[PDB]
RNA sequence: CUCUAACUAUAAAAAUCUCUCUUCUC
């Protein structure tokens, strides 16, 4: 190792409002939480992949300005008894990461997925639309 | 009918001596000169704007680089 | 700054959007002619035109 | 002549809320021009001019009429302002309105001063209308005094 | 220039040296070169021509609009309105008389001014309608070459038309101020505030 | 009429199996019923392999994949394009759409 | 006569309708 200090980038991308939140290893301390919503205005584009990209660019600013120059991607889907497959934006803010020059290690997904469900929302026959 | 553009005058209708002065001194200095261009210093009602400026090919004031109907193009003597 | 980048088009991949008058081709860089992208287009485009793009992370995605 | 702004300057700050008179409407949208600053102009766009679905736009905008709004983006070269119409929350909208009647009143009278007085609104607010919003943030609290304390 | 003798007497400047084109044999087609190499090959100087005036089946094919000399498209697209559709020697006319306008203004040869404007006032991002009816949006796209050039054509004689409507100014001379200026990026001229404009609303619009 | 002898549940000899919910709207829907998808993808698609590939420390990291079956339901089933409408003389073949790609 | 690899990603609103029906025998 070259003294790669590292973090882990720790993206959570729901179907709205996508999270672009890096920490250390320990992942105790927080820093750069910069999410989708706090960038983009339409409010119906909070999930857009322009959100999370230039939430990705902040984050990759701030942690440079830090020290860290290589993250860990942890993707995290909505997970629980919701939908549980990754959010439209966590790939564009996961390309952006690796875009400003950021170097990039041990990709892992780790939505938490259930043994089951307790109860999903939206009654027997769910939602009529 | 809507009378909502309060124009006025605003226009010299008639010229008078020191705009004649003021015609001549800024003959030149007038690297472009045109009957728009005469008209729009608020000194040439514009169709004596005309008259000026065909008066000006006198001593050569200005120069003419086309002389077609409808407007004109003069340029500063150099 | 003013970040505007050029981009050949390489290929043209079909005529997209609900409208029917906006396409999609795959531009290359200028420069790092190996480095591509997919891009949506609003006019008449072939094969060699030059786009200028205010962008270089966007990607094209079909509208509907 | 109404000009040289309320404010210390004549451009807008990021979040400020602010109302707005229309003066005309285009297909993308409507540059229209500020009130709660001076005559600057900037976008409000249809995607968020209305609260609910925009079915009508005269209905809504009613174009010579005074609405709030909020700014969003602003160029800070030569003047250009991009707003909101539909993030303006029930509480906002409130105090948009006492801002703005104070600003009409501190307005109107010293246009009366320059329309009395022939001279440019801009020597007056400099000399006067700055000064005392340094001092007490706002000129309507000063007149207040004035009438009270001297 | 070897002026030839003939029975019949063509003036002495129509026969001085005519391998050297000119456009209204006043300005050269040489000299003038395009800045932006993405509008390159959608401006045509390449060819010379004696006069912007040429009936040249430039609407048959797809793209033959690109190969028609840009002043011609410029004339052809200042002959716009139902008072004055047909009427292109008017337009030819008035070309003419903008592009002697603006040699008198900063020699800088007309053509070059030209180019330079329409290079300056043709938008490089738009929008286009992709709301699905319940909610309304525009989309942000990039815009081809050949689509920037039409557009760049379209405000510039746009701006010309609205400035020489109702106003004492000649329509020669609304268009060399709309020309000069976006040869620079002068705010004031109406083309460039258009582009400037659209572009700004379609950043708004990723 | 009968328009499925096997009734679409796919269940001959049970009487009842346990439900699963629907991932677009959430319809309890049987288990053997309801249409199972396996999603199986890359956690990177090709549009940024090569960027993560520049961009990343351990040379010829193997980047994972993302496996995820979806228990559609079935009105979202034919809505999300995920199963088609089809011949009544063609409703009999059971084999999946002969294999995308070779 | 030998063979299991590639892929995503749309759900705004839309209620109702007064006639009248006519033969096939080479
Ligand atoms: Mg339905
Ligand atoms: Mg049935
Ligand atoms: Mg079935
Ligand atoms: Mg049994
Ligand atoms: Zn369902």
Redesign the pocket.
């Known amino acids: 190792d070259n003294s790669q200090v590292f973090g882990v980038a720790r993206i959570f991308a729901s179907f709205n409002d996508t999270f672009v939140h890096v920490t250390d290893l320990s992942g105790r301390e927080t820093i750069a939480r910069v999410t989708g919503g706090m960038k983009v205005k339409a409010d119906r584009d909070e999930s857009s992949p322009y959100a999370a990209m230039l939430a990705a660019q902040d984050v990759a600013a701030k942690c440079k300005e830090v020290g860290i120059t290589a993250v860990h991607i942890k993707i995290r889907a909505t997970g629980g008894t919701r939908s549980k497959t990754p959010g439209?934006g966590g790939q564009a803010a996961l390309r952006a990461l690796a875009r400003s020059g950021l170097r990039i290690g041990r990709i892992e997904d780790v939505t938490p997925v259930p043994s089951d469900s307790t109860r999903k929302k939206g009654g027997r026959r769910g939602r009529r639309? | 009918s809507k009378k909502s553009h309060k124009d006025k005058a605003k226009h010299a209708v008639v010229l008078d001596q020191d705009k004649f002065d003021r015609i001549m001194k800024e003959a030149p200095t007038y690297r472009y000169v045109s009957v728009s261009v005469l008209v729009d210093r608020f000194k040439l009602g514009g169709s004596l704007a005309r008259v000026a400026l065909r008066h000006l090919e006198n001593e050569g004031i200005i120069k003419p680089v086309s002389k077609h109907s409808k407007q004109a193009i003069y340029t500063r003597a150099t | 700054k003013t970040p505007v980048t050029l981009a050949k088009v390489i290929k043209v991949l079909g005529r997209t959007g609900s409208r029917g008058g906006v396409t999609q081709v795959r531009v290359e860089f200028l420069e790092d002619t190996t480095r591509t992208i997919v891009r949506n287009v609003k006019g008449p485009v072939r094969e060699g035109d030059i786009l200028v793009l205010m962008e270089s992370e966007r990607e094209a995605?079909?509208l509907? | 002549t109404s000009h040289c702004r309320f404010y210390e300057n004549k451009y807008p700050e990021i979040d400020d809320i602010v109302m707005v008179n229309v003066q005309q409407i285009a297909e993308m949208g409507a540059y229209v021009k500020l009130l709660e600053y001076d005559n600057i102009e900037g976008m409000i766009l249809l995607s968020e001019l209305s609260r609910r679905?925009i079915r009508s736009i005269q209905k809504l905008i009613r174009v010579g009429k005074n609405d709030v709004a909020v700014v969003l983006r602003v160029d800070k070269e030569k003047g250009y302002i991009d707003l909101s119409k539909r993030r303006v929350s029930s509480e906002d909208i409130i105090k948009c309105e006492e801002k703005y009647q104070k600003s009409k009143t501190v307005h109107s009278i010293l246009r009366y001063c320059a329309e009395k007085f022939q001279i440019p609104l801009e020597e007056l607010y400099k000399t006067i209308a700055w000064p005392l919003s340094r001092k007490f943030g706002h000129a309507y609290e000063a007149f207040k005094l004035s009438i009270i304390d001297e | 220039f070897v002026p030839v003798e003939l029975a019949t007497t063509i003036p002495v400047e129509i026969q001085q040296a005519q391998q050297e084109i000119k456009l209204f044999n006043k300005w050269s087609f040489e000299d003038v070169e395009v800045k932006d190499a993405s509008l390159v090959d959608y401006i045509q100087i390449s060819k010379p021509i004696y006069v912007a005036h040429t009936a040249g089946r430039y609407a048959n094919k797809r793209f033959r609009k690109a190969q028609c000399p840009i002043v011609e498209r410029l004339t052809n697209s200042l002959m716009m309105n139902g008072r004055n559709n047909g009427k292109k020697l008017k337009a030819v006319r008035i070309v003419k008389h903008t592009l002697e306008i603006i040699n008198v203004l900063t020699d800088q040869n007309p053509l070059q001014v030209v180019v330079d404007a329409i290079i300056n006032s043709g938008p490089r991002e738009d929008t286009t309608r992709v709301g699905?009816?319940?909610?309304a949006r525009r989309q942000a796209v990039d815009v081809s070459p050949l689509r920037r050039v039409n557009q760049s054509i379209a405000l510039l004689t746009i701006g010309a038309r609205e400035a020489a409507f109702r106003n004492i100014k000649t329509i020669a001379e609304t268009l060399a101020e709309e020309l000069i200026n976006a040869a620079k990026g002068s705010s004031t001229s109406y083309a460039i505030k258009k582009k400037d404009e659209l572009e700004r609303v379609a950043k708004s619009n990723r | 009429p009968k328009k499925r002898a096997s009734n679409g549940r796919n269940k001959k000899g049970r009487g009842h199996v346990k439900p699963v919910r629907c991932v677009?709207?959430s319809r309890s829907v049987p288990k053997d019923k309801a249409i199972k998808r396996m999603?199986i993808?890359?956690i990177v698609?090709?549009?940024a392999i090569r960027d993560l590939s520049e961009a990343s420390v351990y040379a010829e990291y193997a980047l994972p994949k993302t496996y995820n079956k979806l228990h559609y339901?079935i009105?979202?089933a034919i809505?999300?394009?995920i199963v088609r409408v089809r011949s009544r003389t063609d409703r009999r073949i059971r084999a999946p759409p002969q294999?995308?790609?070779?």
């Open positions: 439209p639309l | 995605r079909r509907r | 679905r | 699905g009816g319940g909610a | 677009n709207c999603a993808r890359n698609e090709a549009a339901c009105s979202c809505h999300a394009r294999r995308p790609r070779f």
